[PDB]
RNA sequence: CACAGGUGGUCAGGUAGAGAAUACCAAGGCGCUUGAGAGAACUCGGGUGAAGGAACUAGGCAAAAUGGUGCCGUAACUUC
RNA sequence: AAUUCCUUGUCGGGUAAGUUCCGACCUGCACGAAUGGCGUAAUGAUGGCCAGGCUGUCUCCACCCGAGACUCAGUGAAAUU
RNA sequence: GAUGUCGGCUCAUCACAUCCUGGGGCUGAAGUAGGUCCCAAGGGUAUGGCUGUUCGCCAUUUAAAGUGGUACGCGAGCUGGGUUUAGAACGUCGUGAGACAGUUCGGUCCCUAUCUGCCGUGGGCGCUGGAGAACUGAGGGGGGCUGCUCCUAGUACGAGAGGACCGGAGUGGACGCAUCACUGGUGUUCGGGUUGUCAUGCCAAUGGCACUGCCCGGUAGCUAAAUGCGGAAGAGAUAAGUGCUGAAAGCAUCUAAGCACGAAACUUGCCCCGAGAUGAGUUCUCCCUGACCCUUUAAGGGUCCUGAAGGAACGUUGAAGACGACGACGUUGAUAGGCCGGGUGUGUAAGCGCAGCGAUGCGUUGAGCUAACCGGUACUAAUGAACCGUGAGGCUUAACCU
């Protein structure tokens, strides 16, 4: 009954959870701005920030391991080149969450999530 | 004589000279300070109120801050009252050490057990699970019958069914203490104590033989 | 399981005492535009902690 | 932290490092109530659970046509000496499959290093 | 562990080869038998020329446990195959003359020296 | 009923497979008109479980287990 | 006995222990020879029994994966009275 | 006008006409062990074959495997095994349809809890100024089981065999509570092996699907089969019983007076809840020390200013949790997330070169990865705020202070 346990269920099984985490993380790293629910972004952090930390070091093995996630060559290409130097001098906290109210369709807690600076 | 109040950080086995492993519980105890002393004249009974640990000044509000300042004691995590032994006397503000448990050799530990939330009948009262086959339908862990026919016409109080377990005081008696450390402020007691790691524990001398 | 007697309107309204909604009182006051918004939330135009957060 | 403080000083600093699947000899202290003597145990280690003071390893022996499995504590005073003659070559942390297949058909290899 | 209706082997040369543990002694509502215990067994198949026959009921003493034996220092003694020693009903005396297989040291604790003495191992 | 039901005929790809079975894909068509949170008791569909293996039960009910090819080999009875 | 109330008829096998089953006797209330008697290989989503493997059926339940059950947003019944 | 019947599973409760444990009397009571009777219900009171069986026979344990009530307890808790609607057959009766407290096979067990009842958790109000804490305890609830061995003691008894009372110490089964230190299980969020297929242009290497595609292990947590503890000792009043003195009744008498023992029975003593205990308890600490007007002139009303202590709300969250509620933190911070180090688990990552035609191995390498675990780190998220909560708290009496 959840004693020192982590990992939300999101009303999905492991395969769907992993797939939609992967799609969400790819969309975020592509766009640098995503609006979604609070738990979804909170669980996104634990996938994207380690991905950024892995991308901080550029190597063929590191690039292959990164490609094992997000299943996208363009996503990895954007990594190790753009977000690497930007977050090279940053130790964690690459993403931040800004609440923006609730949806009008299902009344779900909405929040924007973005990077630190976004170069904008 | 009185006991101490401490916090559990974990439990680990202890190796003896003959190789026998003694699993004991590690409880850290801070130097308690007496905050109040009660007497027959004012409260009608003798007891001493003590505190342990430290609390942040911002979280501490004015009432308990003034209560602590009256006794000259700093902020503490919580307050507890210990009954004396008809002749033992304590003064306000003196610190309580740990070496006084060098001769009791038997302690009683009370604390808040791990909360299991809303538990079922099988898990709560150790009931017997019904058969999962032979035509059984929608009744596996259900309590089943909870009373007789209309002649009583009611359900008696204290009947056993599902409820909330844990998050309550649990007392374990006749626990052997192995080693006590004064310079490090640790107590080693044989056996298992109720509660989780980091929970506040109250240790008292054994009342039984 | 079904009712044996009809409950009165007194019972209905007496059950609904705890169903009353709770209303916010002190949502927030913006330090730049001075518009109401939810606590720890951005405003209508994406203002939080004085600085723009959404850039439209 | 505090648990570790009791952990370190109870460690034994003369614990050998043995790969899983090696031939390991364990000398244990057996007491008859009056005299202490050394008992030898010949076998191959099949599982190692090295976690703090609770480090343990499981060794299997085929004696009198019957397989016996015994565990030990690397920091307990019951043991006296641990020696390894032949080092096995298995790419698995656990060697639990040795129970099913017979010993004559389950000859281990040597790492050659 | 050892409980009722359990297929058991033999550690002695009495004449039996497989015995059926069907009752465990020691007290009311006895659930399991450890390494040293008194149990009631029935012969399921034995050598025709052995000291015992088929269908006989007699008392047995456990020698090896599949689950293991809990040592005072957190050590377990596992085994591959569970056996027992045939004993007389009226008197707790072994029937077989030899013991084949490992024997635990716990049998000495509860005053069972006959099996320990004529055992060519621990 | 914008219903987990039924409704005749034709077209019949690739991989592996004896196969129109089975598993993934081609073209093609969809995610099944309520969503979002947490992962209590309990219910349903499942996975695994140290020791015993039917001792539970009216009853091996349900579960669990075997499952193919080639070769060797294969009992009582019999209308052969 | 698909037939027997006396019956768990008597004996043996199977089981440590068998009102079930099988094999011998007939004391057939109330079998009986085309409203057919006996046997019969193969066959049967047929009744009963036993054996081997197998397992949470159980001893003794524990954990985990999803759908409901819990909360919020919207729509919004029922039997009974 | 209707599933409602017997048995089985789960769940139990009450009575003692007591199965054991406990206290005794008599005995045709040497002792152990037996028979009878009295008090005592605190606790416990079996596993399998046959039959559906309740009941029974058998086999093996224990102290026993108690007797009954509760719609022969309990089917809006489960089972449909007996009987049994619709089918069919056997034996009997009837010419027959059909029947048979004669036998065999098979043969739908519904309901989303309105109220009382019970288990847990909350909101309002009250406890008379408000608020934060800590406790006494009126009451209520949980448990109260014992086998074996040894010393006493082979002592008393006993011709020997046999074998004590009382007391003390250990070790067992069941029950309950607690914990994950070990042993394991689970651990579809960790790693690895492998089959088919598809995709990343291709080789390599990865990803999806096929029950987590099939397996091997395994972090934390949970859990038991794992390990720690408990069933008290003692005190007070007693049932049966044993008594002292003692008249009525010159004796005698446990009783008429008085006094002393006496059981797992009752209350304490063990643990938990507990001041809604409206009889609303006790203690400590903190805060509030303005003005004006009107009316029917009093626990009156109204206006301006003031908004204290604290509470409330939001965010991070939890070994707390259905929701509530509880606990920790909110820049004066380690509350959560990320990162570093460490630990654990899996197992020698990819790439390079070499050997081998090839599969494959080798040095790089116990390498790479590592979720929930440990110690640090403001890198990110916990905004300045605002809302509720007030302005000294009635009457009468009693003791002091002027």
Curated annotation (Swiss-Prot), chain A:
GO annotation (BP), single: cytoplasmic translation
GO CC term, one of those recorded: cytosol
InterPro entries reported for this sequence: Ribosomal_bL17, Ribosomal_bL17_CS, Ribosomal_bL17_sf
One MF annotation (Gene Ontology) recorded for this entry: structural constituent of ribosome
Keywords: Ribonucleoprotein, Ribosomal protein
Listed Pfam families: Ribosomal_L17 (PF01196)
Family: Belongs to the bacterial ribosomal protein bL17 family.
Stated role: Requires L15 for assembly into the 50S subunit.
UniProt subunit comment: Part of the 50S ribosomal subunit. Contacts protein L32.
Protein name listed in UniProt: Large ribosomal subunit protein bL17
Organism field: Escherichia coli (strain K12)
Gene that encodes the chain: rplQ
Swiss-Prot record, chain B:
Residues spanning the membrane: none
A biological process from GO: ribosomal large subunit assembly
Modified residues (N6-succinyllysine): 38
Coiled-coil spans in chain: none
SUPFAM superfamilies: Translation proteins
Cellular component aspect of the GO annotation: cytoplasm; cytosol; cytosolic large ribosomal subunit
Modified sites of kind N5-methylglutamine: 150
Keywords linked to the UniProt accession: Methylation, Ribonucleoprotein, Ribosomal protein, RNA-binding, rRNA-binding
PTM statement from Swiss-Prot or TrEMBL: Methylated by PrmB.
Oligomer status and interactors: Part of the 50S ribosomal subunit. Forms a cluster with proteins L14 and L19. In pull-down experiments interacts with CedA.
HAMAP family documented for this protein: Ribosomal_uL3_B
Family statement: Belongs to the universal ribosomal protein uL3 family.
Function: One of two assembly initiator proteins, it binds directly near the 3'-end of the 23S rRNA, where it nucleates assembly of the 50S subunit.
Protein name: Large ribosomal subunit protein uL3
UniProtKB/Swiss-Prot annotation, chain C:
Region (Disordered): 1-37
Keyword Amino-acid biosynthesis: no
A Pfam family: Ribosomal_L32p
Top-rank taxon: Bacteria
Keyword vocabulary terms for this entry: Ribonucleoprotein, Ribosomal protein
Gene Ontology cellular component terms for the protein in this record: cytoplasm; cytosol; cytosolic large ribosomal subunit
InterPro entries: Ribosomal_bL32, Ribosomal_bL32_bact, Ribosomal_zn-bd
SUPFAM superfamilies (alphabetical): Zn-binding ribosomal proteins (SSF57829)
Entry's Gene Ontology molecular function annotations: structural constituent of ribosome
GO BP terms in the entry: cytoplasmic translation; response to radiation; response to reactive oxygen species; ribosomal large subunit assembly
Assembly and interaction partners: Part of the 50S ribosomal subunit. Contacts L17.
UniProt xrefs under HAMAP family: Ribosomal_bL32 (MF_00340)
NCBIfam families per record: rpmF_bact (TIGR01031)
Family: Belongs to the bacterial ribosomal protein bL32 family.
Protein name as catalogued: Large ribosomal subunit protein bL32
Organism encoding this protein: Escherichia coli (strain K12)
Swiss-Prot record, chain D:
Function according to Swiss-Prot or TrEMBL: This protein is located at the 30S-50S ribosomal subunit interface and may play a role in the structure and function of the aminoacyl-tRNA binding site. In the 70S ribosome it has been modeled to make two contacts with the 16S rRNA of the 30S subunit forming part of bridges B6 and B8. In the 3.5 A resolved structures L14 and L19 interact and together make contact with the 16S rRNA. The protein conformation is quite different between the 50S and 70S structures, which may be necessary for translocation.
Signal peptide range in chain numbering: none
Name used for this protein in its record: Large ribosomal subunit protein bL19
A UniProt-annotated Pfam family: Ribosomal_L19
Subunit architecture: Part of the 50S ribosomal subunit. Contacts L14. Forms two bridges to the 30S subunit in the 70S ribosome, contacting the 16S rRNA. In pre-50S ribosomal subunits interacts with RsfS, which may inhibit association with the 30S subunit.
Annotated Gene3D superfamilies: 2.30.30.790
Family stated for the protein in its record: Belongs to the bacterial ribosomal protein bL19 family.
Induction and repression of expression: Part of the rpsP-rimM-trmD-rplS operon.
GO CC aspect terms: cytoplasm; cytosol; cytosolic large ribosomal subunit
GO biological process: cytoplasmic translation; ribosomal large subunit assembly
Residue intervals passing through the bilayer: none
A GO term for molecular function: structural constituent of ribosome
